[PDB]
Amino acid sequence: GLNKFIYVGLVISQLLTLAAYVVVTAGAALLQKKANTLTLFDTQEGIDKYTPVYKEVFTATTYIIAYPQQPQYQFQYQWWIIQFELFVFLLTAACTVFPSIIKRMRPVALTFIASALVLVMDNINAIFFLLRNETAKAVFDDYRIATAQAGLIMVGVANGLTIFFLGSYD
C-alpha cells in the first residue's frame, strides 16, 4: 500500500545522502587544500603576527580546533564526520539494496545515524560563524566555506529522511 510508497522515499534519501556526501567531500577538500597552502606563516614575521589571530578565529567557532602550523590537523574533526557518515551510508544504502536485512540491521544503522546527526548539527552551528566572519572568508575562500556548509546541510537533511523511511518499513 503505502509501504511501497515508503521504499521509494528510502531509495531517494540514499541518493540524497550520496549526493550530499560528494558535496561535503568537495568543500572539505577545498578548505584542506587552502589550509595546506597558506602564505601567512612562511616568514617568521607572519608567525608572531598571524598565529594568535589564526588561533582566535578558529577557537571562536567552538567546534573546529585551531592547528595553525598543522594544516592537516585543522579539519581533522570535519574529515571525521565525513568518514563516519560514509560508514553509515555503507549501512543505510546496503539496507536499501537488500531490503531483506532491514529486520536485523536497522537498529544498528539508526544508533549510528543518531550519533552522526549530532556532529553535523554541531558543525553547521560552528561553520555558520565562519561565514559571518570577514577574516575567515578572507583567508579561507568564502565559497569554500559555503561549499562545506551546504554539503553538511544536505547531509543532515538526508539523514532526517534516512531516519524516517528506514525507521518505518515493512
* Residues near Hg ion, by CB under 5 A: 91, 94-95, 105, 109
List the one residue out of 113, 91, 126, 101 whose CA is nearest residue 157: 113
Q: Does 113 bind a copy of itself (CB under 8 A)?
A: yes
Among residue numbers 12 through 71, which ones bind a copy of itself (CB under 8 A)?
A: 55, 59-67, 70
Among 7, 41, 50, 73, binds a copy of itself (CB under 8 A): 73
Among the residue ranges 7-15, 92-100, 113-121, 144-152, the one whose residues contact a copy of itself (CB under 8 A): 113-121
Instruction: Give the whole-angstrom CA distance, residue 115 versus residue 111.
Output: 7
Angle at the Cα of 55 (from 53 to 56), degrees rounded to 5?
65
Q: What is the DSSP string of 54-82?
A: HHHHHHHSSSSPP-TT-HHHHTHHHHHHH
Binding site for a copy of itself (CB under 8 A): 55, 59-67, 70, 73, 76-77, 80, 104-108, 110-115, 117-119, 121-122, 125-126, 128-129, 132, 163-164, 167-169
